[PDB]
Amino acid sequence: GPSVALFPPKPKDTLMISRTPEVTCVVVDVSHEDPEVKFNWYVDGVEVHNAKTKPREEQYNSTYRVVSVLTVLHQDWLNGKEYKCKVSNKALPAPIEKTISKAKGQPREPQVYTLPPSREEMTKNQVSLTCLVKGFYPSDIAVEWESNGQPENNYKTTPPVLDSDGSFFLYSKLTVDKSRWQQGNVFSCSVMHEALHNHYTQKSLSL
């Protein structure tokens, strides 16, 4: 029968007030016999009525996928409100409920440091600029490298790692042509996290 998956907003969308965070309720294996699907949404038990249900989407295996998207208030998500999707369908003996919310725990402010390439790496044609982000909680975070107000195309960020004090850390490594570093171009590591002032900080690094 029908099955439901409930997906959280992207951290960056919850952290930047200009962006639009969404909770997404997805129903799959909706049958042709009982194709109609009702979604009820609740926020800490109180029904809300602003969800947009997308049109049914027919799969290659003769079932439908039906999606309801609930726009959330950034502050509600960050204040730990519970989002419940209730999915009714005539093939279900009772409606399916799923609930989600933000990871729990006292927030802790990330410390953000940029580290230049080792002198030993300067023998190479590409070099590594390092962004250390440590002491944060919970693990929900976004970390991005930019130059001239635009994202860099060769960086990779480690997952959050539990540190010995129960906070998280990660590193993001930016690789650039050595000549760009030598020319004095400025590179910036932007970090978004709920325990930062304005949910944002940026640290820059140049030769």
Ligand SMILES: *[C@@H]1O[C@H](CO[C@H]2O[C@@H](C)[C@@H](O)[C@@H](O)[C@@H]2O)[C@@H](O[C@@H]2O[C@H](CO)[C@@H](O[C@@H]3O[C@H](CO[C@H]4O[C@H](CO)[C@@H](O)[C@H](O)[C@@H]4O[C@@H]4O[C@H](CO)[C@@H](O)[C@H](O)[C@H]4NC(C)=O)[C@@H](O)[C@H](O[C@H]4O[C@H](CO)[C@@H](O)[C@H](O)[C@@H]4O)[C@@H]3O)[C@H](O)[C@H]2NC(C)=O)[C@H](O)[C@H]1NC(C)=O
């Ligand atoms: C008939 O076909 C259906 C359509 O899918 C297939 O189409 C065919 C034509 C091929 O193209 C094939 O490749 C496709 O798979 C089948 O639908 C599938 O059903 C299964 C079983 O119900 C679903 O499994 C769930 O998967 C969840 C994760 O889903 C996300 O990630 C997937 C990639 O890893 C991706 O495919 C999904 O679309 C979805 O993507 C996420 O979308 C959200 C919302 O839009 C977005 O915000 C995210 O960024 C995005 N994330 C990522 C990483 O891409 C699991 O979480 C889920 O498990 C949860 O619920 C369980 C209980 O329900 C529970 O046990 C778990 O613990 C957990 O809570 C579950 O495993 C699968 O998603 C679904 N595929 C799609 C595309 O919807 C169908 O099964 C099949 N039916 C039959 C009878 O044959």
Ligand SMILES: [Cl-]
């Ligand atoms: Cl913003």
